[PDB]
Design a protein around this ligand. Sequence first.
Ligand SMILES: CC(C)CCC[C@@H](C)[C@H]1CC[C@H]2[C@@H]3CC=C4C[C@@H](O)CC[C@]4(C)[C@H]3CC[C@]12C
Ligand SMILES: CC(C)CCC[C@@H](C)[C@H]1CC[C@H]2[C@@H]3CC=C4C[C@@H](O)CC[C@]4(C)[C@H]3CC[C@]12C
Lengths: 512, 512
Amino acid sequence: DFVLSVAGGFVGLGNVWRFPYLCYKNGGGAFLIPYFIFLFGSGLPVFFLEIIIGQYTSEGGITCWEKICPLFSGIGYASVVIVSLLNVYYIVILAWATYYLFQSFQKELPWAHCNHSWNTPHCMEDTMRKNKSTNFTSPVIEFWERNVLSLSPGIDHPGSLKWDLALCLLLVWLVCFFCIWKGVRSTGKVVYFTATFPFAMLLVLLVRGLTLPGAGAGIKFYLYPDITRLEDPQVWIDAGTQIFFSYAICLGAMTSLGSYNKYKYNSYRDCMLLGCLNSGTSFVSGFAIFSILGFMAQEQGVDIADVAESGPGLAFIAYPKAVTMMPLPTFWSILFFIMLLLLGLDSQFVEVEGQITSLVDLYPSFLRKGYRREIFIAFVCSISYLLGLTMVTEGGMYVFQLFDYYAASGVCLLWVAFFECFVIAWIYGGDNLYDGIEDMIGYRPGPWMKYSWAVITPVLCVGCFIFSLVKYVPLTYNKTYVYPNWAIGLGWSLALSSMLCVPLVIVIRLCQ
Amino acid sequence: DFVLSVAGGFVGLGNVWRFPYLCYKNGGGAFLIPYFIFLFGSGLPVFFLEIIIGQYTSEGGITCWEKICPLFSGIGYASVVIVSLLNVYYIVILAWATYYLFQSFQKELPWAHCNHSWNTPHCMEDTMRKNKSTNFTSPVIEFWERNVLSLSPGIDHPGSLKWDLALCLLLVWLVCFFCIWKGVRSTGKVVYFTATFPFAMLLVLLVRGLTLPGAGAGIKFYLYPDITRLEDPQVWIDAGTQIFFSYAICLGAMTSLGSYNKYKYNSYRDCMLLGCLNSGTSFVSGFAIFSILGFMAQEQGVDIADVAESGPGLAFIAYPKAVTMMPLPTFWSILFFIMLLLLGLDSQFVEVEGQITSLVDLYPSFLRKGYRREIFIAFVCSISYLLGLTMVTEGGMYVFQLFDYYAASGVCLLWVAFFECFVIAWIYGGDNLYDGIEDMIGYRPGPWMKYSWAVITPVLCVGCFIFSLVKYVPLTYNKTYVYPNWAIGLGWSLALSSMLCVPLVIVIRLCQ
Ligand SMILES: CC(C)CCC[C@@H](C)[C@H]1CC[C@H]2[C@@H]3CC=C4C[C@@H](O)CC[C@]4(C)[C@H]3CC[C@]12C
Ligand SMILES: CC(C)CCC[C@@H](C)[C@H]1CC[C@H]2[C@@H]3CC=C4C[C@@H](O)CC[C@]4(C)[C@H]3CC[C@]12C
């Protein structure tokens, strides 16, 4: 059962969706070096740490933190907050994918050309800019902004709700609802179809994506860094949080994976073999999308920095462009739109039940297996559905960025990641942990992650935090929109809701 | 130990060397369909067959054929002949790789430009043909033909021996000699370095290879087929033999792999997981090289059919071109030249000892473990070294093609593959085989390979044989050179040496 969730909750759309966006927004290749140092310094170390603690305790995420130390036990509650706030917009990511999929059930793709009612008259076809109001946009960009989101001018103007997204969001929630209620495994039928279908097509996208004439500009922008961007701290926090995002760590779902693994079982190899591949697929997917970005870069005459839209949903623009350029677009458009669900639902299936199994034992005597649990699954889905309706609003894209940058990223993941390595290294003792691991996997793991949990990762988490404090640059959308002061406070309160889980519990735990 | 040889003898240079050549010589995409039908019809079926029989008998290749049936026991002897005739030129393939590697230990690669003594004055630089004796050649083409082979005008003119290749061939034989004598495993130190280094760089070659502006022509030529080429039978036999070559089947080395696997062990999954990947890596490598071929195709102004040299050694032309175009050519040239040994030596290490373990028990009372075996390893290497000196001669490239097309390919592999599936399906009985397999791997394998061994594979082997008989087109080099009648007879006698192993043994076995 553990292997199934590895292909499920462990694998996330952020590898193919957020990773190219996070790299794109933070310059180009200047993202890669912080990505790699954060990976090799904390990511794989803390990944093996949380897997091994879940295996050693053979219990849940919340209970393991208490067992290691009665103090600092709020990491589990923070993880529950993070997974809920992650689900509430991951589900609307899948809703956007499904709405796109339904729109692709046509002879001609809607974003192939912009001659429809919704498209702005200033829209202009992609190919003819060079064959022949200087600001000219692209049909695919417009489709995502208006037909899909109908983005409002500002967050202070919500606007009318888009019923088309709501029904699509209704479908994905029900799909997640029935499988969990019926006890359906994350991978339907044969795991191979849920596994080889993603890997094959990312290669398919990679093959033509690299074949595109503009791939040379994209790869150079993807790989070559800028030292100037390294000074500005937001590239560091984004690179780190991508590590805590793609590997779905500091969520507590992977802790259940450890309990699933046998107490006497070598999980060390499984951590790094899957961890390196997860970065490899993310890196490989970077080549395809950035080549597509490079392909559109030379051919609109616009720089690579502003050729794309610097908002979440980049994977909803680049690859849909590629499939239109790829022969027989309708067949390829559906398949890529299918797997986006196949990459997301399994992630959703594992992670959503992650807190469900975390909450059933958290509040016993009322969540018994049977009548009480079925309403709870409906209860948790319904309350999250209503919270998910904020993004269905025309102005909900601005709300969407708030969760993405604050609820399950930014300082939120750095703070919890610090306290995860802090408790083991100093309070529990890294040597005490390794003493079990020698008896668990059969041999001593390398001291390198012990030092990583000791100084490297604590400095990596702490260093970016103060760098953000002194060099506080407010978050922006599409590098052109500034949120109001109250909007930032709403996003921070979400982080502070995850922040105060730990500091309050010690105050809570000391009183009795 | 079985897994080590999977990364060793099972993986061959023919995936990255012979597969792109065989596809290139037989048109373009017209090679793929016969490749795939032969794969799914015989390749994986007969692969699982030979693995499962090696596992069931837990013995050697020669002994297993006798155990299944006293008649038709010459398949083992034929396999020994095939592995010896394969080694004798696989080793000089590695010798060419090493000579190239030693020539690459310089600031400027010798084939980057042709301004040296050996290069013909009619040679001309690659880049300037379009910036500005119509037949103009390429510096990389000349380098392989003269500096590396000094190819003679005809096979009837051997010419002086090239001492530079002989010492390089001496090095590789010694390298294979010491490891086998010292009992060194196929993969040195950590298997990961011998495994991740090949896979990483083929992606590296793929990344820029697809990035090359001419990749569009190459992929279209790689994928789009021609029905006209399908009529001419040589595309069929080459596609089939590539299956029997890349998977190293009908050699008897993989039979030792079956004996290594536990009697009660599910080897069925290991066969298809590794088999599909072997085709996948071959197919993926096809994209990189043909894009390189497409890259040079548009940029010399010559058609894709004749842009390259239609002789064995294509992987010694395309990729060495790519590394020169790839920035910092010296660093990349060495690494690709290292792995060609790393892909070949492990293949050599497993296969050469394959007959050694096959011959030690074949002739007991004289090949005892100790003094008798050490001279035999020297004896087998020395006699093969002298036979390998034929290719070191300036005219040995024409000899080289004779082994490649006859000794370990062509009708040679079809004839043995037919008799492998013939004995199990009719004499032994496919149902009798599956009865064990149900008790071996725990469940019944799919009837599909049973029918494959019954009618599909026998028709596939038989059909191409008569098609070659009636439509007999003599072998040619670079689609421009015709061998003399005696040269063809010498090549056929080599096949007939492998052919007559079976028909004689029944005549031999019936007398006593
Ligand atoms: C997945 C791992 C192996 C990383 C991928 C390859 C690594 C080693 C990188 C490092 C340097 C890179 C090259 C740097 C510059 C260029 C020139 C550009 O016009 C095409 C891409 C190309 C040729 C890059 C290809 C990928 C490359 C070779
Ligand atoms: C490894 C497996 C998945 C096969 C690889 C991909 C398969 C499905 C093939 C089938 C059709 C192929 C496409 C057919 C035509 C073209 C147009 C050409 O100008 C660039 C390559 C491109 C875009 C090909 C890319 C690879 C492709 C998509």
